[PDB]
Amino acid sequence: NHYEVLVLGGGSGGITMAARMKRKVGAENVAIVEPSERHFYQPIWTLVGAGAKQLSSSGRPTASVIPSGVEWIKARVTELNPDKNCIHTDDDEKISYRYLIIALGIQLDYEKIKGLPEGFAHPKIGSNYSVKTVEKTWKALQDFKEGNAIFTFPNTPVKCAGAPQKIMYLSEAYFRKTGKRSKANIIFNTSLGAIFGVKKYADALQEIIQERNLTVNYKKNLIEVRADKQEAVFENLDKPGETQVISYEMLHVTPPMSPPDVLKTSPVADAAGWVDVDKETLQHRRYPNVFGIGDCTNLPTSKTAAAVAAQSGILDRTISVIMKNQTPTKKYDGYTSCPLVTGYNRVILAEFDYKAEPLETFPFDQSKERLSMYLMKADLMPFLYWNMMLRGYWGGPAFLRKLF
Amino acid sequence: MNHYEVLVLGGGSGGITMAARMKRKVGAENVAIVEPSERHFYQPIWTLVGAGAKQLSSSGRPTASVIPSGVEWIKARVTELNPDKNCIHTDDDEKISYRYLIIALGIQLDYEKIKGLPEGFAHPKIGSNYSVKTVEKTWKALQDFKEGNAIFTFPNTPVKCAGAPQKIMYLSEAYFRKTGKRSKANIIFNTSLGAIFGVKKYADALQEIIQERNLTVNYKKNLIEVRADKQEAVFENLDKPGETQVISYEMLHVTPPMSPPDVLKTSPVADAAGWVDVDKETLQHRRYPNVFGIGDCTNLPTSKTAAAVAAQSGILDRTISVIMKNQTPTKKYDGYTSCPLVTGYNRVILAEFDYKAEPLETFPFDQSKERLSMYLMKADLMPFLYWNMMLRGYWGGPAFLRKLFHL
Numbered sequence: 001n002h003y004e005v006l007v008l009g010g011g012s013g014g015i016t017m018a019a020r021m022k023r024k025v026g027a028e029n030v031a032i033v034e035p036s037e038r039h040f041y042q043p044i045w046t047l048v049g050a051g052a053k054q055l056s057s058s059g060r061p062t063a064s065v066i067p068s069g070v071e072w073i074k075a076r077v078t079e080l081n082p083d084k085n086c087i088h089t090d091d092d093e094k095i096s097y098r099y100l101i102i103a104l105g106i107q108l109d110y111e112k113i114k115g116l117p118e119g120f121a122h123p124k125i126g127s128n129y130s131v132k133t134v135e136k137t138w139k140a141l142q143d144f145k146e147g148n149a150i151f152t153f154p155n156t157p158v159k160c161a162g163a164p165q166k167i168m169y170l171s172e173a174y175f176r177k178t179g180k181r182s183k184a185n186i187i188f189n190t191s192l193g194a195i196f197g198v199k200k201y202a203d204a205l206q207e208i209i210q211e212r213n214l215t216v217n218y219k220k221n222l223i224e225v226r227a228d229k230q231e232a233v234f235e236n237l238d239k240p241g242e243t244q245v246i247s248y249e250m251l252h253v254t255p256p257m258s259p260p261d262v263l264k265t266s267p268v269a270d271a272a273g274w275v276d277v278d279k280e281t282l283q284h285r286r287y288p289n290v291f292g293i294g295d296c297t298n299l300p301t302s303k304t305a306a307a308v309a310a311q312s313g314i315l316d317r318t319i320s321v322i323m324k325n326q327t328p329t330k331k332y333d334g335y336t337s338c339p340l341v342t343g344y345n346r347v348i349l350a351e352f353d354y355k356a357e358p359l360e361t362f363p364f365d366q367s368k369e370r371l372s373m374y375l376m377k378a379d380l381m382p383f384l385y386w387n388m389m390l391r392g393y394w395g396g397p398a399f400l401r402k403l404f
Numbered sequence: 405m406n407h408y409e410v411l412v413l414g415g416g417s418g419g420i421t422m423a424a425r426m427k428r429k430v431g432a433e434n435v436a437i438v439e440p441s442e443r444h445f446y447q448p449i450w451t452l453v454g455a456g457a458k459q460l461s462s463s464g465r466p467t468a469s470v471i472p473s474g475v476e477w478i479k480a481r482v483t484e485l486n487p488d489k490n491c492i493h494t495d496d497d498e499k500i501s502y503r504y505l506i507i508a509l510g511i512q513l514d515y516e517k518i519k520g521l522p523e524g525f526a527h528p529k530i531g532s533n534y535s536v537k538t539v540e541k542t543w544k545a546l547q548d549f550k551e552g553n554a555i556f557t558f559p560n561t562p563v564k565c566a567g568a569p570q571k572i573m574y575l576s577e578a579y580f581r582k583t584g585k586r587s588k589a590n591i592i593f594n595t596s597l598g599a600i601f602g603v604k605k606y607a608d609a610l611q612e613i614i615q616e617r618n619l620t621v622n623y624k625k626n627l628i629e630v631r632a633d634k635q636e637a638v639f640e641n642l643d644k645p646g647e648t649q650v651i652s653y654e655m656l657h658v659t660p661p662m663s664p665p666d667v668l669k670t671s672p673v674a675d676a677a678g679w680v681d682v683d684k685e686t687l688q689h690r691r692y693p694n695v696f697g698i699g700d701c702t703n704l705p706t707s708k709t710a711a712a713v714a715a716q717s718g719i720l721d722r723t724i725s726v727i728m729k730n731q732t733p734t735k736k737y738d739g740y741t742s743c744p745l746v747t748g749y750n751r752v753i754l755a756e757f758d759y760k761a762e763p764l765e766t767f768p769f770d771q772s773k774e775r776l777s778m779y780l781m782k783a784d785l786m787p788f789l790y791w792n793m794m795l796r797g798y799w800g801g802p803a804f805l806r807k808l809f810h811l
């Protein structure tokens with residue numbers, strides 16, 4: 001079998017590109033290889049675990065988001081042979097392509113922590129990063145009575161770097177408005193030395209932490225979970241060899257993450273396993289008919305759906321000129337955004353580019369907690385996601401930004 | 405299924421050392437080494453091979469000649485590991501089970517991640533001291549050098565012997581002066597890193613030499629493409645994502661990107677990043693109590709060197725004995741490592757440190773200074789002790805000699 005355009009991955013980047021590609025080469029010349037039955041708008045999972053949104057609202061059947069006419073090949077990619085323009089699937093089938101677009105996302109690795117994912121079968125522990133553990137966050141919050149509440153951040157790349165602390169501010173506000181704050185010691189144990197990588201939003205988060213009696217312990221990485229005993233083990237990344245066992249009344253886990261297994265050894269990967277693409281055009285550095293988008297690439301900016309949206313716009317142009325034997329000229333800037341939920345009524349909308357410097361859209365100031373930015377995150381963006389991005393029409397708010 | 409009490413994956417520096425030590429503990433018949441290569445190499449001397457000072461063929465011996473006598477040698481490649489079922493697969497289509505497992509699969513070279521490589525090595529003026537196929541091409545390119553750029557790279561990955569990408573730079577610079585062509589060479593070190601070295605005492609000494617010898621170091625520069633035909637090289641700027649620089653060379657020494665061995669990258673015994681996940685004090689595995697790891701393939705947060713393998717092998721010996729007696733380990737690895745920075749054909753800055761990244765020097769004098777003594781020890785004493793003492797299980801680092809210097 002053969003397709004002018006073969007898309008690996010039916011998540012955010014995959015559907016968006018197949019939508020856009022259908023209009024360029026025809027729906028009958030595009031195929032998507034995606035194994036899962038459901039497609040998830042993962043960003044709302046932060047609010048699900050805080051008890052603010054229902055989980056079933058976050059997903060729809062994968063057949064709903066397939067652009068009509070585009071082939072859904074429900075399989076797992078198990079091998080890439082770009083030298084001979086094909087891939088293999090766990091159906092023992094070989095698929096050739098004229099062009100290839102890789103959008104396989106990022107892989108969660110709960111089992112590299114001793115005791116996970118088995119311990120998740122016990123109470124008081126949860127994780128907003130997986131459809132099987134996001135509601136367990138919310139139950140741990142309701143079931144909280146007295147003690148330590150621990151929020152973690154791993155020593156790997158992650159998607160939505162702001163999410164692990166978003167649920168901490170949500171959990172804090174929950175304990176206050178429910179009469180349990182006095183009984184909570186609230187701890188952010190993070191592998192990093194900084195609360196956030198862009199200083200003007202870091203400063204604003206530092207302010208909140210200082211006023212709400214939250215503790216941040218830097219260079220602490222979760223390595224072991226003893227669910228039965230309600231204990232967690234951290235290693236001190238500043239003192240190799242040193243560890244600390246902490247008891248918890250509630251534990252929220254951000255798991256270690258890595259590029260998908262089939263990409264780790266693939267020829268399309270760099271040394272570290274991410275898809276090796278041009279940092280501006282998103283074309284593969286060694287295979288001119290391969291392209292990458294989203295979490296699975298080595299694009300040196302934060303891994304978010306916003307970035308996918310802005311990346312799709314650029315890639316649409318790059319593949320088009322390539323198909324026409326022209327040199328690309330439109331360049332990606334590293335745009336990305338984190339809507340930092342600081343409470344049930346407020347969001348700090350951080351936006352920046354490759355320069356790790358702010359690049360805000362709205363003329364007011366997004367360093368300050370805002371109801372409008374909360375309502376945008378909670379209500380508008382899911383709507384634009386299902387009805388505009390996955391239909392290949394949203395490509396970054398730079399065209400909206402330059403209006404004002 | 406075939407079975408052995410102690411199974412060693414990899415017959416390089418750490419694997420041969422642990423097998424000799426284990427033979428004396430459980431008997432040679434209960435030890436097996438899985439290693440596919442016919443030849444065992446003392447890679448440290450390759451630095452002096454690329455500089456024209458030592459013969460490549462003396463850096464190697466047949467693997468059969470270093471296999472501790474009586475130990476089984478399984479000439480094959482490990483293709484999968486299954487710690488849950490105490491077994492591994494080989495490219496023979498054979499499984500092998502174990503009571504204890506020592507992982508020593510080193511680190512892996514990824515020349516093909518640079519566009520143009522390794523095809524470009526067919527051309528002159530380009531070499532790499534990190535591969536037996538390319539270490540002599542460094543020397544030849546250095547002999548062929550007439551005029552222009554001599555470029556030396558450092559990748560955006562973990563490496564082994566972090567010092568070697570610049571040892572060859574100093575050796576080449578000396579050679580240029582030795583042969584009267586220093587005037588005609590512009591000498592560039594393009595590093596992905598932000599600093600010349602990670603311990604300040606020795607960084608300062610290296611900076612003094614960069615200044616006195618007029619070397620240019622461009623930080624956050626990563627080699628991404630070689631065009632051997634046109635003798636150009638393409639570097640990416642890690643501070644400004646997206647921009648690149650094309651620059652011609654008259655000599656290019658490539659330090660390749662490096663990574664865990666493919667077989668480990670997806671394995672249950674690796675951490676999320678692919679390195680063997682071990683306890684940083686005892687070298688015991690964090691999740692499987694009967695797996696241990698040594699050397700370049702581990703997540704031990706210190707320099708990847710054979711000196712480290714030596715110091716870890718003494719710890720691991722004590723760790724495994726205590727484990728076989730069902731006790732708790734108490735001897736702790738401190739992260740000892742050492743990098744003999746060859747700064748010229750007769751001087752060496754013997755850098756030694758530990759997990760704190762602070763100096764832990766063995767000799768009573770100051771190893772921050774270039775020394776002839778330390779060069780001779782690197783070039784002549786160390787290979788002899790390697791072939792005759794480390795590979796026989798009788799070298800585990802020099803901390804006894806350091807404590808001995810206590811009056």
Ligand SMILES: Cc1cc2nc3c(=O)[nH]c(=O)nc-3n(C[C@H](O)[C@H](O)[C@H](O)COP(=O)(O)OP(=O)(O)OC[C@H]3O[C@@H](n4cnc5c(N)ncnc54)[C@H](O)[C@@H]3O)c2cc1C
Pocket residue numbers: 008009010011012013014033034035036041042043044045046075076077078103104105106128129130159160163260262293294295296303304305306307308337338339
């Ligand atoms: C809790 C949480 C909150 C977040 N909040 C925000 C937010 O507020 N703002 C924001 O901008 N972003 C947010 N994100 C990030 C956003 O969800 C992702 O960055 C986005 O989904 C990236 O899409 P992707 O296409 O790169 O990968 P995904 O959308 O994850 O999809 C990748 C697809 O690849 C498929 N796949 C995997 N392996 C294979 C294989 N071998 N063969 C075939 N298919 C395969 C998967 O099934 C999946 O469908 C959040 C993420 C989480 C988890």
Ligand SMILES: Cc1cc2nc3c(=O)[nH]c(=O)nc-3n(C[C@H](O)[C@H](O)[C@H](O)COP(=O)(O)OP(=O)(O)OC[C@H]3O[C@@H](n4cnc5c(N)ncnc54)[C@H](O)[C@@H]3O)c2cc1C
Pocket residue numbers: 413414415416417418419438439440441446447448449450451480481482483508509510511533534564565568665667698699700701708709710711712713742743744
């Ligand atoms: C140019 C250079 C200069 C150096 N200089 C110094 C120095 O001055 N001082 C110092 O202390 N160190 C130095 N080193 C470092 C030293 O070479 C290594 O750190 C040391 O060899 C580590 O040993 P190891 O067992 O981990 O791996 P290695 O000795 O590299 O060997 C690992 C073995 O695993 C085998 N293997 C790989 N994959 C598989 C598989 N799938 N199945 C089975 N077997 C497999 C390989 O064939 C190899 O034999 C230098 C290295 C280089 C490249």
Ligand SMILES: COC1=C(OC)C(=O)C(CC=C(C)C)=C(C)C1=O
Pocket residue numbers: 614615618619620621622
């Ligand atoms: C980029 O390479 C160089 C440096 O980087 C390490 C220097 O520090 C220096 C020293 C700086 C001063 C002011 C002497 C020189 C001369 C140089 O060429």
Ligand SMILES: COC1=C(OC)C(=O)C(CC=C(C)C)=C(C)C1=O
Pocket residue numbers: 718798799800801802803804
């Ligand atoms: C020369 O023989 C050796 C010993 O006997 C004195 C050791 O105790 C030890 C281990 C103890 C220290 C403090 C290095 C090693 C490694 C060794 O090689």
